[PDB]
Design a protein around this ligand. Sequence first.
Ligand SMILES: [Ca+2]
Ligand SMILES: [Ca+2]
Ligand SMILES: [Ca+2]
Ligand SMILES: [Ca+2]
Length: 262
Amino acid sequence: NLGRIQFSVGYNFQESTLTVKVMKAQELPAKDFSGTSDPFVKIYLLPDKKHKLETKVKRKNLNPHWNETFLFEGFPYEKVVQRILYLQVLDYDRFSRNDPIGEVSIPLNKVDLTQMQTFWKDLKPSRGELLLSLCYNPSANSIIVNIIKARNLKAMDIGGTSDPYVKVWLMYKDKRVEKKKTVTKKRNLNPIFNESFAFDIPTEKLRETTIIITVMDKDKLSRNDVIGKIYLSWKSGPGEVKHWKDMIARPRQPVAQWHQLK
Ligand SMILES: [Ca+2]
Ligand SMILES: [Ca+2]
Ligand SMILES: [Ca+2]
Ligand SMILES: [Ca+2]
């Protein structure tokens, strides 16, 4: 489906070091128009999502050979077995977001880390995207959210379409502060909204502000279905935090960005 990746993993008691070698992959799909991809690998010892390692990029190669060794030193064995070795394979794109190919994860407590061993693991894996802009104006203590359009929305009516509308919630800490909502576009999975929403946000509340954008399918005569959500704050997904950072970092300048619905 998405290819498979070869790697080995082993622990050394004398050195208290976990070793992880990302050897190669095979049959990775194509993510560039050239019919090829530029695969590289991110490596995590979950739940630690902060410290990541990467392989080099192999330009235009659907069967890359990395053969790169990654070390995690000073780890007691009782701590290693608590972690989940997470590998994410992505296609590198020079002028756009890197295209994720696939991922694999294995709990180390199931592994005989005493001896180095090799694993072949098949790479494993959408509600739609929403294009929106944020603009923070500190002198006016405002954030303007523009709900512009969405594409490839999930069909939530059994007939094969949805009736999307987008609601925008302003949050402070854990409390709901204000609600906004767009009009409903019926029978549209790629709706254009071009609606603007302005929220008053004092400087003191900026750090603890969260904007929750929920794309809904208006099912009349029934509980409306949720197509997906977006969380915009300092503690959200990478792309979400990135947009939130660009907004705050470039005050008064609108910043638009696509966001996968979740
Ligand atoms: Ca690509
Ligand atoms: Ca690429
Ligand atoms: Ca529905
Ligand atoms: Ca509906």
